[PDB]
């Protein structure tokens, strides 16, 4: 991917509001293994079949 | 087709000592008015339900 060029003002005086915490998806997957796997496999299979 | 084969279960039921078996025949007329409205949309939704298996769409 081509790197983005930032204006010099954004480098010296730039700030960003972002929440850097990462939330684990384990509670959904562990409790619901069949449902989560079926949803993700079907969507993933949908894209690959269109190659 | 062959009338005897297609109507074979009924032909066997109507000539049988067993009386538990019953034959029920239904003919529906002027159901296009019933076909109007809700159940047409139900057919449309049943057809739409298959779009979840195909990726590209608008």
CSV table of C-alpha atoms in Angstrom, one decimal:
chain,number,residue,atom,x,y,z
A,1,UNK,CA,0.0,0.0,0.0
A,2,UNK,CA,1.3,3.5,-0.9
A,3,UNK,CA,2.3,5.4,2.2
A,4,UNK,CA,0.3,8.5,3.1
A,5,UNK,CA,2.0,12.0,3.1
A,6,UNK,CA,1.0,14.2,6.0
A,7,UNK,CA,1.2,18.0,6.0
A,8,UNK,CA,3.9,19.4,8.1
A,9,UNK,CA,1.4,21.1,10.4
A,10,UNK,CA,-0.3,17.8,11.2
A,11,UNK,CA,3.1,16.4,12.2
A,12,UNK,CA,4.1,19.1,14.6
A,13,UNK,CA,0.7,20.1,16.0
A,14,UNK,CA,-1.5,17.1,15.3
A,15,UNK,CA,-3.6,15.1,17.8
A,16,UNK,CA,-6.0,12.2,17.4
A,17,UNK,CA,-8.8,10.9,19.6
A,18,UNK,CA,-8.6,7.1,19.5
A,19,UNK,CA,-9.4,4.3,22.0
A,20,UNK,CA,-6.4,2.0,21.8
A,21,UNK,CA,-7.9,-0.9,23.9
A,22,UNK,CA,-8.5,-4.2,22.2
A,23,UNK,CA,-11.6,-6.1,23.2
A,24,UNK,CA,-11.3,-9.9,23.0
A,25,UNK,CA,-14.0,-11.7,21.0
A,26,UNK,CA,-13.5,-14.9,23.1
A,27,UNK,CA,-16.8,-14.6,25.2
A,28,UNK,CA,-18.9,-14.8,22.1
A,29,UNK,CA,-16.9,-17.5,20.4
A,30,UNK,CA,-16.4,-19.8,23.4
A,31,UNK,CA,-20.0,-19.7,24.5
A,32,UNK,CA,-21.3,-20.0,20.9
A,33,UNK,CA,-18.9,-22.0,18.9
A,34,UNK,CA,-21.3,-23.5,16.3
A,35,UNK,CA,-23.0,-20.2,15.6
A,36,UNK,CA,-19.9,-18.1,15.4
A,37,UNK,CA,-18.1,-20.6,13.2
A,38,UNK,CA,-21.0,-21.0,10.8
A,39,UNK,CA,-21.4,-17.3,10.3
A,40,UNK,CA,-17.7,-16.7,9.6
A,41,UNK,CA,-17.2,-19.7,7.4
A,42,UNK,CA,-20.2,-18.9,5.2
A,43,UNK,CA,-19.2,-15.2,4.7
A,44,UNK,CA,-15.6,-16.3,4.0
A,45,UNK,CA,-16.7,-19.0,1.6
A,46,UNK,CA,-19.0,-16.5,-0.1
A,47,UNK,CA,-16.0,-14.2,-1.1
A,48,UNK,CA,-13.7,-17.0,-2.1
A,49,UNK,CA,-16.2,-18.7,-4.4
A,50,UNK,CA,-16.3,-15.4,-6.4
A,51,UNK,CA,-12.6,-15.4,-7.2
B,1,UNK,CA,-48.8,-39.6,-17.4
B,2,UNK,CA,-50.2,-42.9,-16.1
B,3,UNK,CA,-53.4,-42.5,-14.0
B,4,UNK,CA,-53.0,-45.7,-12.1
B,5,UNK,CA,-49.5,-45.0,-10.9
B,6,UNK,CA,-50.0,-41.4,-9.9
B,7,UNK,CA,-53.3,-42.2,-8.1
B,8,UNK,CA,-52.0,-45.6,-6.7
B,9,UNK,CA,-52.1,-44.8,-3.0
B,10,UNK,CA,-55.7,-43.5,-3.3
B,11,UNK,CA,-56.6,-46.6,-5.4
B,12,UNK,CA,-55.2,-48.8,-2.7
B,13,UNK,CA,-56.9,-46.9,0.2
B,14,UNK,CA,-60.4,-46.9,-1.4
B,15,UNK,CA,-60.3,-50.7,-1.7
B,16,UNK,CA,-59.1,-51.9,1.7
B,17,UNK,CA,-60.5,-53.6,4.8
B,18,UNK,CA,-58.5,-51.1,6.9
B,19,UNK,CA,-60.8,-48.1,7.8
B,20,UNK,CA,-58.3,-45.9,9.7
B,21,UNK,CA,-56.9,-44.6,6.3
B,22,UNK,CA,-58.9,-41.7,4.9
B,23,UNK,CA,-58.6,-39.8,1.6
B,24,UNK,CA,-59.0,-36.0,1.7
B,25,UNK,CA,-59.2,-34.0,-1.5
B,26,UNK,CA,-58.9,-30.2,-1.6
B,27,UNK,CA,-59.5,-27.9,-4.6
B,28,UNK,CA,-58.6,-24.2,-4.2
B,29,UNK,CA,-60.3,-21.6,-6.4
B,30,UNK,CA,-60.0,-17.9,-6.7
B,31,UNK,CA,-56.8,-17.9,-4.5
B,32,UNK,CA,-55.2,-15.2,-6.6
B,33,UNK,CA,-56.9,-12.7,-4.3
B,34,UNK,CA,-55.3,-14.6,-1.4
B,35,UNK,CA,-52.1,-14.6,-3.5
B,36,UNK,CA,-52.3,-10.8,-3.5
B,37,UNK,CA,-50.5,-9.1,-0.6
B,38,UNK,CA,-48.8,-10.8,2.3
B,39,UNK,CA,-47.9,-14.2,0.8
B,40,UNK,CA,-46.4,-12.7,-2.3
B,41,UNK,CA,-44.1,-10.7,-0.1
B,42,UNK,CA,-43.4,-14.0,1.8
B,43,UNK,CA,-42.3,-15.6,-1.5
B,44,UNK,CA,-40.2,-12.6,-2.2
B,45,UNK,CA,-38.5,-12.8,1.2
B,46,UNK,CA,-38.0,-16.6,0.8
B,47,UNK,CA,-36.2,-15.8,-2.5
B,48,UNK,CA,-34.2,-13.0,-0.9
B,49,UNK,CA,-33.0,-15.3,2.0
B,50,UNK,CA,-30.5,-16.9,-0.4
B,51,UNK,CA,-28.6,-13.7,-1.0
B,52,UNK,CA,-26.6,-14.2,2.2
B,53,UNK,CA,-24.6,-16.9,0.5
B,54,UNK,CA,-23.4,-14.7,-2.4
B,55,UNK,CA,-20.9,-11.9,-1.6
B,56,UNK,CA,-21.2,-9.2,-4.2
B,57,UNK,CA,-24.5,-7.3,-4.1
B,58,UNK,CA,-26.2,-3.9,-4.0
